[PDB]
Design a protein around this ligand. Structure first.
Ligand code: MG
Ligand code: MG
Ligand code: MG
Lengths: 64, 113, 332, 274, 174, 64, 277
RNA sequence: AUUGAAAAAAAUAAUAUAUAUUAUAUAUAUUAAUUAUAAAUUGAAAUAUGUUUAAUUGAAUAUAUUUUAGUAAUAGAUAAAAAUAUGUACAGUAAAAUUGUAAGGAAAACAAUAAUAACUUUCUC
RNA sequence: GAAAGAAUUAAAUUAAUAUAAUGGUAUAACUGUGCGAUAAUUGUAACACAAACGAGUGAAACAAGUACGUAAGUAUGGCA
RNA sequence: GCCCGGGAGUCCGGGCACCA
């Protein structure tokens, strides 16, 4: 109920995916991991789109 | 955005913060730095000397006191006992002020009570 | 005004550059624009002068057995700004006589302090972590720095950081040591020895390792300023085991080459010692035993480590050695 | 992570090794906090501390004199008691906690030339309680503290939870400042010359306020804070003011000594009988 | 040099008369303009201060004038005066060689001493403690107004025998 | 009901680059009840301050 | 010789005999360890050398050995070709340098063995480029060659006399080079200069500079440049740079600047950059 | 480099430029930046250009151009209030109880509460 | 004789451990902080413990890449 | 998981797959 599964696809287009579980609110996940096809680390990104529990963009530039 | 009180509070906070108020850290030429270091060392040495002086003086005083006590016990026992009487509640004059930077209008008092 | 005088006091205690001295006494930052930009702190002059006067006075007061005398001298000098300037802002490794004399005690002391601050510590760490000490020689107490170099092969210039990996090319020909002594020792009568040992060569009989002595100098004369052990100095009489290079066998781990420096036992002139150059077994070699025999006291050490590579075969060939064994990749 | 098992391998040398120096990571951090090269540098002896001078010249000797008993040796206080070995169970047993209390107590050394009572440090804690509701109050209090002292305070957060009062952990409430050296002396002078006098009905510090190992404490109401110079000059600027506690740590072995020392600096202890 | 900027915006209001007055006393820092050479570095100004350099701030109602720290000097005579060396510790000394007020068994010693000296003038002293010092000497501190003579620690060395000075040198503080 | 100032993302003070708080202060002249002047370093902008109610006039500090 | 897993399970890292012990270094801790052989006790003497196993066997079987020799890390394999290429390039460069040196020698007219001399020169140059006093560098170079010769002799079981002769020849060559030739500021080769001579030259240059510190024309500037053009042969690099900084000041003592008085606009004598630049 | 002030160079490190080597070295030069980051009509400052007055100076005031003011914490390798639960690197100790202190107590916050034998450096008889 | 440093000894302990109970833990696994979001990666896993089988548990080593670390090394999620 | 009814978000009620 809280934790859904998601598929993370290699940004190098070897089509090697890896799966992980996250909370429903969880931010858009990416993680760099080893891709055995390309034989080097690469970024893995969410394949399917999903709504995210929106967080306010914290302001570094002293606004107002 | 914010109430006047809030603004005031913010200002107050800023007064304490180092935000935008602090200057750039002072750099030094090598020679200058060396000179500074030397000066510091000298100062330290002076301080140490002063401490020794004072400490030494204190020690001497203590020794003197001890000697007196030794004499006193030998000589007048009652007197010695009286001298010993522990000062558990002793408290400084209060009229005996702390040194100021510049002296007062009446530079000393004659009449009292 | 003792620091102004230079009769008995060596000339090295002053700043050799005149401009700098002038600046100090009433700058260096080369560029004109930068100089213009610069703004020193106020009231530095008079206060500085006062400080100098104070410290000079102290030095004078200080001024009056050998070690004690040396110590006193050091105490007197240290606070001299000029000496500080010299030490801090000029190179201690490739020392230059007149700028920093290690004949002069103050400078020596400063050097020692510097060593203690960093390099010595680093060396110690390397020894401990890599298991140099307990494995070869029980312990040491630092005493003197020892910096090695491999100038002849390749041709480049670099002081080796302790516990580095050197290519077989680099360590193909012999090294150069600089044993920077401190601690008020005799110079005429005191001799030294230097041993490059590697304790991890594969013993197949026992299945453990055995320690080889790959390079051995004895009865070397040193000087506080002149301490580079080049073929100029030592001569062929001083070599007990002539240099053999690191030639690690394939898959025989990382062989640790640990250079030890010892000082001779002291009894009129320079006391030598014979060491049965032929009899001494170098292929398998007991360091501790050797030390016990000749009563050495290990002052300083340095270390590097070698691994197999394509180049080693060539090196072996050059040196006229066997082709070199090859070991299984598994630690079975 | 596989291990989870802390075990330092023993070494084979007596060289100390200050790891930080072997790392090139924090090159500014390598220097002392008083070496000019460091960004953490600030000057210490900006001018002379008059109060400290007074202590050194006049008071210290007096203190040495007055405290001196004849051949008073250490009356070492109550410690952890070892177990009588009249049974085998005592063998590897931890010792008995002190006869009097749970905590172990220090030895009282005689007042000689080497260890005369002195002022060590002054800690001011202003726990504004109304800050449970309004967090801006805390900030204001901190500012006030800063104004009073001239050295950065540190925030005091609510360490406990309790329903009866509206108190929940993790809530900034008040400010705490540690005063030392010349600054502390200055503060004390300000307290004594200006504030404590000006406060209307003040009969002096209470004589029971001894920490018992030579520490003394006293309060100041929200009204008295107006009497400080940095606040008095602008009453328009300070609508709300906050009361505070003041703790004074001394090199004194016992409370009475400490209070005597304080009296030397013009602190009226007419509050009570010891 | 290292101080923070003076935060005038807190102390003084941005439309006040006092604030205006304050501003009038102050002179600003030379700002930067595109097209000019600043050979002393470019002005790094933030919050109304050049970061590069030290920054200073100019400032019954009455100007506070301090009293002179030298009345003794003016006097140039009164060795029997208390308002003499104000920033120095003084000690009472009496003539006969000449020395500290000696006074020659039912009472406690310090108390007796106090009593003895109280009679010679009519002054107000405070004994530091019953504990004596030296050969039996008591210490005491004055609070009110053969020779009544007052001296510093250095001045006494000239006015007394060497041996005596040696005996009681460590008593006389600076 | 909890009235707060909602914090910004704070500034990272690097290790070694922390500069100690040297607040701007003036060497103020403090005149007491009597003519005794005393110097103290204060953060408020004022050269001179004379005082009406001080320790020197209060009976508790002096029985004269 | 004992490991510890996630459960705090103790396991053997090496073949051997299990022992339980108390270690003095760690009071109030019980230890399990593996002694490498039975006879010896396990809380082993702290300073005595640590008994290691090694425990790899050597590939006698020749094919296997060959295979082992062949096989290397993947990283090495990846970056080997590149490395080789780099090496080749370096070699080429060296060859070129050697050729240049030879040409220079020919121009000079010095006797030469020639190849050896060239090699020596190159070595010296390399040393110079790296941080070495020149004489010392030369010596080092000589020594390298000597060492090589010795090695060769050892390899081929030479008649020592021959070796000696070779050494002598080498020494002679070095002397010839040392006396005849010397590298410069910019690491190019020219005819030799002694120390005193060099000093004299420097002095002369200084004098010239002093004389002609006006520079009131293009011609003058040109002359100055020409004069500078021979400075490398008798001057250190840093010194030369300093000199250049001093005397080819891009401008001499229409813009605008600031001053301590109040802005200050300056037109300038416009013959300060035309001849300068 | 030109402006100020009144022959050169000899560390570490950083930056710029070059080259040496199947060695992350060396040579030359210089020592920058160290809490900043968009968007403000009335806040403040500076400079440039005018007019007036006691060739210039100061002062007043006008216009232009810029600079500041968005005010926001910890300033310490922070250490038992909250917030980050996995890696590594470096560091440090908790809790209770007792004695105290404005409101403040059974129960808010802060402070204090074990031994210096030996050793090193510094200052001193 | 003093100051400072390095400490050392004693007490360590029920505080704290994402979570029950137990065992552990200051040499800290507990806490703080820098960097880092990387070992909460990819092929072979011997050999043990446990075990009817199905399963489970610890895990050396080989190879590929990554993170932190001056280095030694450490990391195949969480003190168990 | 997908589709509705009461730009985004929350809170509720319908369906439509999944149902080995
Ligand atoms: Mg437990
Ligand atoms: Mg963990
Ligand atoms: Mg099974």
């Amino acid at each position: 109920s809280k934790n859904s599964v998601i598929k993370l696809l290699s940004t190098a287009a070897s089509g090697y995916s890896r799966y992980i579980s996250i909370k429903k609110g969880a931010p858009l996940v990416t993680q760099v991991r080893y891709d055995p096809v390309v034989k080097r680390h690469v970024l893995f990104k969410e394949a399917k789109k999903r709504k995210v529990a929106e967080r306010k963009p914290l302001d570094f530039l002293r606004t107002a | 955005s914010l109430s006047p009180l809030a603004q005031r509070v913010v200002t107050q906070l800023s007064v304490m913060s180092a935000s935008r108020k602090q200057p750039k850290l002072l750099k030094l030429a090598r020679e200058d730095l060396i000179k500074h270091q030397t000066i510091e060392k000298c100062w330290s040495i002076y301080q140490q000397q002063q401490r020794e002086r004072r400490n030494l003086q204190l020690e001497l005083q203590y020794k003197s006191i001890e000697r007196s006590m030794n004499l006193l016990q030998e000589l007048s026992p009652r007197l010695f006992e009286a001298a010993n009487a522990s000062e558990k509640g002793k408290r400084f004059p209060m009229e005996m002020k702390v040194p100021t930077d510049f002296p007062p209008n009446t530079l000393w008092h004659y009449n009292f009570r | 005004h003792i620091w102004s005088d230079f009769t008995t006091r060596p000339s090295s205690l002053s700043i050799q550059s005149s401009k700098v001295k002038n600046y100090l006494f009433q700058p260096s930052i080369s560029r004109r624009s930068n100089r213009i930009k610069y703004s020193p702190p106020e009231h530095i002059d008079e206060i500085f002068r006062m400080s100098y006067d104070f410290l000079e006075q102290r030095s004078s007061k200080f001024y009056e057995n050998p070690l004690k005398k040396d110590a006193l001298l050091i105490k007197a000098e240290i606070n001299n700004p000029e000496v500080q300037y010299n030490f801090q802002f000029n190179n201690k490794l490739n020392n230059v006589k007149d700028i920093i004399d290690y004949d002069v005690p103050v400078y020596r002391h400063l050097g020692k302090q510097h060593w203690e601050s960093y390099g010595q510590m680093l060396l110690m760490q390397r020894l401990e972590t890599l298991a140099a000490i307990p494995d070869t020689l029980p312990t040491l107490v630092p005493r003197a720095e020892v910096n090695i170099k491999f100038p002849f092969s390749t041709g480049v210039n670099k002081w080796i950081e302790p516990g580095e990996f050197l290519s077989s090319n680099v360590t193909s020909m012999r090294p150069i040591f600089k044993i920077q002594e401190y601690e008020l020792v005799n110079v005429e009568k005191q001799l030294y020895t230097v041993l490059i040992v590697n304790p991890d060569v594969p013993d197949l009989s026992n299945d453990s390792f055995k320690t080889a002595l790959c390079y051995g100098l004895v009865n070397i004369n040193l000087t506080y300023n002149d301490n580079l052990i080049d073929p100029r100095k030592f001569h062929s009489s001083n070599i007990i085991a002539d240099y053999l290079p690191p030639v690690p066998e394939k898959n025989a781990g990382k062989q640790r080459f640990v250079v030890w420096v010892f000082r001779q036992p002291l009894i009129q002139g320079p006391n030598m010692l014979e060491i049965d150059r032929k009899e001494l077994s170098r292929d398998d070699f007991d360091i501790r035993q050797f030390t016990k025999k000749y009563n050495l006291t290990a002052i300083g050490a340095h270390i590097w480590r070698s691994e197999w590579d394509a180049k080693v075969a060539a090196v072996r060939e050059k040196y006229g050695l066997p082709p070199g064994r090859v070991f299984s990749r598994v630690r079975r | 992570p596989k291990s989870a098992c802390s075990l330092v391998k023993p070494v084979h040398h007596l060289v100390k090794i200050d790891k930080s120096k072997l790392s090139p990571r924090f090159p500014e951090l390598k220097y002392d906090k008083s070496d000019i090269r460091s960004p953490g540098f600030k000057p210490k002896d900006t001018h002379a501390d008059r109060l400290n001078d007074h202590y050194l010249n006049t008071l210290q000797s007096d203190l040495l004199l007055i405290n001196y008993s004849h051949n008073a040796a250490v009356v070492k206080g109550l410690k952890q008691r070892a177990w009588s070995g009249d049974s085998p169970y005592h063998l590897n047993r931890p010792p008995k906690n002190p006869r009097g209390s749970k905590a172990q107590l220090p030895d009282i050394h005689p007042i000689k030339w080497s260890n005369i009572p002195g002022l060590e440090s002054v800690v001011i804690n202003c726990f504004v309680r109304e800050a449970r509701e309004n967090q801006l109050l805390a900030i204001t209090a901190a500012l006030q503290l800063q104004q009073i002292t001239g050295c950065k305070p540190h925030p005091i957060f609510s360490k406990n939870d309790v329903p009866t009062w509206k108190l929940r952990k993790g809530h900034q409430m008040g400010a705490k400042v540690e005063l030392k050296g010349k600054e502390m002396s200055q503060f004390l002078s300000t307290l004594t010359e200006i504030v404590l006098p000006r406060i209307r009905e003040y009969k002096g510090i209470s004589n029971q306020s001894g920490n018992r190992f030579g520490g003394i404490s006293f309060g100041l109401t929200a009204e008295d804070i107006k009497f400080f110079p940095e606040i008095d000059a602008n009453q328009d600027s300070w609508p709300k003011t906050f009361g505070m506690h003041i703790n004074i740590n001394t090199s004194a072995q016992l409370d009475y000594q400490a209070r005597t020392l304080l009296s030397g600096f013009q602190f009226p202890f007419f509050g009570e009988e010891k | 040099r290292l101080m923070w900027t003076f935060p005038a915006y807190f102390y003084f209001k941005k439309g006040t008369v006092a604030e205006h007055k304050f501003l009038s006393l102050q002179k600003g820092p030379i700002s930067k303009k595109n097209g000019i050479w600043f050979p002393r570095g470019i002005p790094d100004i933030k919050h109304g201060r050049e970061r590069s350099t030290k920054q200073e701030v100019k400032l019954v109602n009455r100007p506070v004038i301090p009293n002179d720290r030298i009345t003794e000097a003016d006097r140039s005579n009164d060795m029997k005066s208390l308002e003499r060396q104000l920033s120095r510790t003084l000690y009472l000394l009496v003539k006969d060689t000449w020395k500290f007020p000696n006074f020659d068994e039912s009472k406690p010693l310090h108390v007796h001493a106090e009593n003895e000296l109280k009679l010679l003038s009519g002054i107000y002293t405070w004994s530091v403690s019953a504990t004596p010092i030296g050969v039996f000497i008591v210490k005491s501190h004055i609070l009110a107004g053969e020779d009544f003579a007052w001296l510093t620690k250095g001045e006494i060395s000239e006015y007394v025998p060497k041996d005596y000075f040696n005996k009681t040198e460590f008593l006389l503080a600076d | 009901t909890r009235i707060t100032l909602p914090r910004r993302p704070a500034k990272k003070i690097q290790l070694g680059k922390s500069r100690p708080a040297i607040y701007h202060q003036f060497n103020v002249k403090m005149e007491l009840s009597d003519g005794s002047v005393v110097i103290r370093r204060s953060q408020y902008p004022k050269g001179e301050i004379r005082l009406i109610q001080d320790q020197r006039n209060n009976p508790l500090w002096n029985p004269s | 010789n004992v490991g510890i897993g996630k459960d705090h399970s103790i396991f053997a890292l090496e073949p051997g005999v299990v022992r339980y012990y108390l270690d003095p270094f760690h009071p109030k801790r019980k230890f399990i360890g593996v002694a490498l052989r039975r006879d010896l006790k396990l809380p082993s003497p702290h300073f005595e050398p640590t008994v290691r196993r090694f425990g790899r066997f050597e590939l006698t079987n020749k094919r296997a050995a060959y295979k082992e020799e062949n096989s290397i890390s993947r990283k090495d394999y990846l970056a080997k070709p590149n490395i080789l290429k780099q090496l080749e390039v370096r070699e080429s460069k060296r060859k070129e340098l050697q050729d240049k040196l030879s040409k220079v020698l020919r121009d000079e007219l010095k006797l030469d063995d020639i190849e050896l001399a060239t090699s020596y020169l190159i070595r010296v140059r390399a040393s110079l480029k790296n941080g070495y006093p020149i004489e010392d560098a030369r010596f080092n170079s000589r020594y390298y060659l000597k060492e090589e010769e010795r090695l060769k002799a050892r390899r081929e079981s030479w008649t020592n006399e021959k070796l000696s002769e070779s050494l002598s020849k080498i020494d002679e060559c070095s002397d010839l080079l040392n006396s005849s030739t010397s590298f410069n500021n910019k690491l190019e080769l020219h005819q030799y200069i002694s120390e005193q001579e060099k000093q004299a030259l420097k002095a002369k240059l200084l004098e010239d500079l002093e004389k002609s510190q006006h520079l009131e024309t293009k011609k003058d500037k040109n002359y100055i440049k020409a004069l500078f053009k021979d400075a490398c042969n008798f001057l250190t690099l840093s010194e030369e740079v300093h000199l250049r900084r001093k005397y080819l000041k891009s401008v001499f003592p229409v813009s605008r600047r600031f001053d301590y008085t109040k802005v200050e606009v300056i037109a300038r004598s416009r013959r300060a950059f035309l001849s300068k630049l």
